[PDB]
Amino acid sequence: KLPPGPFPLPIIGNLFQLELKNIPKSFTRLAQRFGPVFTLYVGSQRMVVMHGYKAVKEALLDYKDEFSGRGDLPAFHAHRDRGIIFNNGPTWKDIRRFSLTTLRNYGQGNESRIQREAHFLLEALRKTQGQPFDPTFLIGCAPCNVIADILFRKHFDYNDEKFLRLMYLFNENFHLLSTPWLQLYNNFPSFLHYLPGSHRKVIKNVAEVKEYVSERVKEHHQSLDPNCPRDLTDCLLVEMEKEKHSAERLYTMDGITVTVADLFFAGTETTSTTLRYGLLILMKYPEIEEKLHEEIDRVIGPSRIPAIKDRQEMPYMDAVVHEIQRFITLVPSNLPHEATRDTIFRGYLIPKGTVVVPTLDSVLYDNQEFPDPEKFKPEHFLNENGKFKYSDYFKPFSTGKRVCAGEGLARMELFLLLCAILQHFNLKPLVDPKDIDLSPIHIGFGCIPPRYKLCVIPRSH
Ligand code: HEM
Numbered sequence: 001k002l003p004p005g006p007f008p009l010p011i012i013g014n015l016f017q018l019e020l021k022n023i024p025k026s027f028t029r030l031a032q033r034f035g036p037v038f039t040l041y042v043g044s045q046r047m048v049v050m051h052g053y054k055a056v057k058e059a060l061l062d063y064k065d066e067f068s069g070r071g072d073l074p075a076f077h078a079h080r081d082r083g084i085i086f087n088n089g090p091t092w093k094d095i096r097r098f099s100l101t102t103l104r105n106y107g108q109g110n111e112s113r114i115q116r117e118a119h120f121l122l123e124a125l126r127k128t129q130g131q132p133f134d135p136t137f138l139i140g141c142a143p144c145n146v147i148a149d150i151l152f153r154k155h156f157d158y159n160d161e162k163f164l165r166l167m168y169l170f171n172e173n174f175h176l177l178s179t180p181w182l183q184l185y186n187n188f189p190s191f192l193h194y195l196p197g198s199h200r201k202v203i204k205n206v207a208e209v210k211e212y213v214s215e216r217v218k219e220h221h222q223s224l225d226p227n228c229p230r231d232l233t234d235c236l237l238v239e240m241e242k243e244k245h246s247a248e249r250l251y252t253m254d255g256i257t258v259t260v261a262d263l264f265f266a267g268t269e270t271t272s273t274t275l276r277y278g279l280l281i282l283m284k285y286p287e288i289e290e291k292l293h294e295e296i297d298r299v300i301g302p303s304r305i306p307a308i309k310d311r312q313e314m315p316y317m318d319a320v321v322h323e324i325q326r327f328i329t330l331v332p333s334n335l336p337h338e339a340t341r342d343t344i345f346r347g348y349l350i351p352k353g354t355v356v357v358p359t360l361d362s363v364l365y366d367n368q369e370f371p372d373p374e375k376f377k378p379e380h381f382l383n384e385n386g387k388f389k390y391s392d393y394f395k396p397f398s399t400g401k402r403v404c405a406g407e408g409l410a411r412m413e414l415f416l417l418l419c420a421i422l423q424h425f426n427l428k429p430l431v432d433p434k435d436i437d438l439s440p441i442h443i444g445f446g447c448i449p450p451r452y453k454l455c456v457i458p459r460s461h
Contacts, residue, residue: 003048003348005039006030013041020180022443024332024361027051031362037346043187047355048345051362053369053393059337059345059358060400066343068401071336071355074189075177075202078210083258084405085266088338091250095259099405102235106150110412113149115305117142118420124158125425125456132430132453135279139421140167140272143413147267151260152216153231166212169205170269176202177445213261217253233260267406270330270446271413277449278324278418281376283429284436288378289422291316293459296423302460306419308412314419315388319381321415325396327376328440330447332361334398360395369393376438425456 006017017040018026030038031051040047050059059067070088072080081089084096106113121142128138141158144167148154156163176182176198185192185199193199220233229235236259240251282289295316300306311318337356342349350356365373369391370380383389397404404410429436430453440447 001349002046003037003039003345003350004034006034008041011043013043013045015042018042020183023183024329024359024443027333027357027359028362037348043191045187045355046351047357048348048350049357049359051359053363053366053395056358056360056363056395057399059356060398063343063345064401066339066341066350067337067356067358069338069340069353069356070402071338071357073336074186074193075182075199076206078203078206079258079262082252082255083260083262085262085335086258091255094250095255096405098236098239099232099259099263102232103150103405103409106232107408110409111308111416113146114413114416115307117146118305118417120145120158121417122420122424125421126458128456130455130457132455134451134453135276136171136272136451137164137167139275139279139417140171140268142417143271143275144268146409146413147264149231151232151263151267152220154216162212166209166264167268167272169209170265171272173202173205173209173265174269174273174446175442175448178440178442178448179444183444209265210257210261213257213264214253217257217260221253232263236260263405266404267409271410273446273449274325274328274330274410274414275417277328277330278320278414279421279427279454280429280436280449280452281324281327281438282320282422283427283454284433284438285376286433288320289427292320292422293426296419300419300423302423306416306423308416310419311415315382315386316378317415317419318388319378321411321418322381322394323376323378325414326364326370326380326394327438328447328449329361329364330396331398331445332359332443332447334358334360335402337402358398360398363393363395366393421456424459426459428455428457430454 006014008014017030027049028051030049036050036052036055038049040049050056070086073086076086079086081087084092084099124138145155148156179198181198182202217233221237224234224237226238226241229238233256236251236256240256243249243251295314299313300310334357337358339350339352339354339356342352367373381389397407397410437450441450442448
């Protein structure tokens with residue numbers, strides 16, 4: 001039979017068992033009642049939820065081909081079954097694989113690219129002149145430009161209009177997709193798609209991001225030189241000129257825009273948010289910032305640009321960089337998976353096409369691995385001798401068949417960037433540390449941090 005679960009109602013299914021402002025909290029609640037694997041009908045879509053590390057691991061790692069489907073996500077129909085993030089189609093495996101190699105090869109690697117970005121990041125910060133600013137569209141430019149170098153060999157000035165416009169759309173999409181109305185819509189799309197509302201803005205934003213990618217792509221083709229891949233959208237293009245004679249093609253001008261649109265969005269927004277969350281966290285705990293400042297100076301000093309080698313001798317920072325990703329559970333319910341095959345899991349039948357949800361928050365806040373998981377504590381990642389302590393539970397990028405395609409870059413960005421920033425600036429907040437409320441203001445697709453301002457105070461002059 002199916003995993004156990006509350007008894008669904010006609011039409012709405014299990015919707016009264018779900019707080020829409022906070023699906024993950026409902027999941028945790030249902031997990032107290034029914035254990036680590038359970039069934040939910042939301043609207044008429046059947047859903048199995050895995051909660052806790054044993055169940056989440058097994059699902060992601062033991063059943064790595066039965067659960068490598070991508071659950072549907074209506075707001076993103078313009079990407080469905082193409083690109084990487086949202087194809088559940090035939091076409092995902094190789095587009096993904098190829099995309100992975102290409103990033104590795106552009107990884108003049110990832111450390112220079114990031115390091116060179118840092119120079120413009122630090123400049124923009126200098127330019128705020130210790131006045132109050134909203135960092136959301138200052139610090140975001142940096143992962144935006146890095147992904148944009150790989151993708152288009154393009155580099156944007158920190159206030160070129162289309163630049164700001166792109167980031168803005170990424171940011172609105174991640175925000176909106178974390179709101180109640182978008183959770184309902186994503187599960188009741190036919191009932192709700194032609195009513196007014198928030199879903200339309202997301203759809204219009206998705207389309208707009210595609211148009212801008214689309215053009216960059218037509219432009220790349222119209223001056224393509226197969227001896228010279230200038231970037232990643234080149235390498236995909238080349239891969240399409242190869243197989244033009246074949247009856248089975250898996251590359252489409254539309255497919256390539258999706259692929260790139262995907263990498264652009266994902267490569268910009270999760271990293272931006274995490275950094276922006278970090279700055280708010282470090283500002284709540286001035287003593288943690290302080291320990292950080294003295295460690296940078298000791299190991300790197302006020303001048304020399306940070307570099308990945310510096311990590312293995314910076315155990316506090318490495319602990320902090322991880323604890324920020326653990327504490328915030330940025331994509332708390334993972335992205336949805338679905339069953340490719342009628343599957344048996346702990347003796348339960350999971351019917352093909354069942355959406356499968358390997359919960360990440362429930363792993364990152366394991367009471368056992370991370371005593372006081374609700375509290376931000378770098379020692380969650382320090383052994384009793386002050387050294388870095390790794391955890392099998394550090395899973396904010398998921399794992400297995402659909403693991404983030406960007407994990408390496410992401411992790412490199414968080415450490416070098418958070419290193420740069422702190423090397424040159426003191427963070428300072430416009431309210432007491434005592435008063436910063438770290439709670440996300442929406443929870444769905446993502447965990448979204450409160451809007452805030454800060455000042456950055458130079459350390460070198
Ligand atoms: C802190 C930053 C990031 C976090 C927390 C994050 C997290 C995730 C998560 C949870 C998933 C879905 C996992 C699954 O389905 O099993 C994912 C998928 C993905 N990520 Fe990220 N990601 C981040 C940064 C990036 C970056 C920088 C890129 C681009 C270089 C990227 C590209 C993707 C893509 C294309 C997928 C789709 C996976 C697939 O279906 O094949 N992500 N990421």
